[PDB]
Nucleic acid binder design. Structure first.
Ligand SMILES: Nc1ncnc2c1ncn2[C@H]1C[C@H](O)[C@@H](COP(=O)(O)OP(=O)(O)OP(=O)(O)O)O1
Ligand SMILES: [Ca+2]
Ligand SMILES: [Mn+2]
Length: 430
DNA sequence: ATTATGACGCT
DNA sequence: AGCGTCAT
């Protein structure tokens, strides 16, 4: 009862860019705006691989991971923008720089945690408190929430989508108790007002649209964000959780989309997140471990305590390339040339990072894959990163991997390498 | 031949 | 440390 924690202590948002790489290309090339279009990397093999898809193109069934030649079968008028190639490889610099544009705007409102190239968590608890006091107990007008959905509403006692949105928003606002400054529902609502402001700022200052989730923790905020995309935001209240989770496949919750989630389903014989409430914490810990068990017990009740970490910059800077099928590297000269290409991109990015962010990487991680292994990485080795010099880094990378070569002949490389990966890690202030 | 990343957990 | 998982 009264001592039962409800995980309503924080206001957390997740802001995620809509079809991000496509918007970056659409800003650059107005011919692509408001069109079925996708971003592709490489081209020779099956037209290139799609990595981002506009919502117009999704209507035709175009998806990520599709070959462009195959996407064209679904959508003959599909427009394409290609990822830049430098030093023989895809180069994602344009999108990383566009990401920084957005992250720096978000950071004006609150502490953010960079969660991917196109999304960040926001801890809005303090900002909400401040806005609540400037608000002096006045009601919140629907006009302040023009793109907000309230998950679970409307309910009870109609045709258009925007009509439904407003109906639900009005039910929510009509029920709000605005003279309690510690009401979690009110806090979420004020959070949503701030996120409208944040999203407007992002669009005004970059041209990019985004969606957002507002809830009491990161997992619910992420889930919320996806419920109404694109260009909308969704508030998931604590009270909405039992109905929301009652038909929510376990795999939809962040961290449960893989083997652990499959094991929860198989071992317990359930399908939906809500069904987890019928197990004791000890039961869940017995199957999934102490940490996962406790996390699942709380999470299926809408409760999670993972903090929004104050980190805007990536912790590592890496460069990787696959060499599939017959392109697998089979000579020492090949392996060395590509290590140099990777190292040259890495040096460029590291040198910029040092100037921008007052830090230096101190460790170089080298990873490779060998033909026939279908693990992502076959082998990882580290060495000291003491100078931002591509020839040195590529020589050092070669040194730590050269013994992987089972070939008798020095020139030849066996078994052929199907992936190379250089990663700069362990940053120190500089 | 579903590529190029990036964070965090386990032992 | 080196490997595995999950993610976008
Ligand atoms: N598996 C991947 N491989 C390479 N790049 C990816 C992959 N997944 C995502 N990206 C890139 C391209 C995306 O535009 C960008 C952001 O990803 P993501 O948020 O999942 O989708 P999205 O922004 O393209 O559309 P959405 O509107 O559904 O969020 O990151
Ligand atoms: Ca996105
Ligand atoms: Mn994303």
């Amino acid at each position: 009862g009264p001592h039962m924690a409800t995980g309503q202590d924080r206001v957390v948002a997740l802001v995620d860019m809509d079809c991000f790489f496509v918007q970056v290309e659409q800003r650059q090339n107005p011919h692509l705006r408001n069109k079925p279009c996708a971003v592709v990397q490489y081209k020779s093999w099956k037209g290139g691989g799609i990595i981002a898809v506009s919502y117009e193109a999704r209507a035709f069934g175009v998806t990520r991971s599709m070959w462009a030649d195959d996407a064209k079968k679904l959508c003959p008028d599909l427009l394409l923008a290609q990822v830049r190639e430098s030093r023989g490889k895809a180069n994602l610099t344009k999108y990383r720089e566009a990401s920084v544009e957005v992250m720096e705007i978000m950071s004006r409102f609150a502490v953010i945690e960079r969660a991917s190239i196109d999304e960040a968590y926001v801890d809005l608890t303090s900002a909400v408190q401040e806005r609540l006091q400037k608000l002096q107990g006045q009601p919140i007008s629907a006009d302040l929430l023009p793109s907000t959905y309230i998950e679970g509403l409307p309910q009870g006692p109609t045709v258009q989508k925007e009509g439904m949105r407003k109906q639900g928003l009005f039910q929510w606002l009509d029920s709000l108790q605005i003279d309690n400054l510690t009401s979690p529902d009110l806090q979420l609502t004020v959070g949503a007002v701030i996120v409208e402001e944040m999203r407007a700022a992002i669009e005004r200052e970059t041209g990019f649209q985004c969606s957002a989730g507002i809830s009491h923790n990161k997992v619910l905020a992420k889930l919320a964000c996806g419920l109404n995309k694109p260009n909308r935001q969704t508030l998931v209240s604590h009270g909405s959780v039992p109905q929301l989770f009652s038909q929510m496949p376990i795999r939809k919750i962040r961290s449960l989309g893989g083997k652990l989630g499959a094991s929860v389903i198989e071992i317990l014989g359930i399908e939906y997140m809500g069904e987890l409430t019928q197990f004791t914490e000890s039961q869940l810990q017995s199957h999934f471990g102490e940490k996962n068990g406790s996390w699942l017990y709380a999470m299926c009740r809408g409760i999670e305590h993972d903090p929004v970490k104050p980190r805007q910059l990536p912790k590592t800077i890496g460069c990787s390339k696959n060499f599939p099928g017959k392109t697998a590297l089979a000579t020492r000269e090949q392996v060395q040339w590509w290590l140099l290409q990777l190292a040259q991109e890495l040096e460029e990015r590291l040198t910029k990072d040092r100037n921008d962010n007052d830090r230096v990487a101190t460790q170089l991680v080298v990873s490779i894959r060998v033909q026939g292994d279908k693990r992502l990485s076959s082998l990882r080795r580290c060495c000291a990163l003491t100078r931002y010099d591509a020839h040195k880094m590529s020589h050092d990378a070669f040194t730590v991997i050269k013994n992987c070569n089972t070939s008798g002949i020095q020139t030849e490389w066996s078994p052929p390498l199907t992936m190379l990966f250089l990663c700069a890690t362990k940053f120190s202030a500089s």
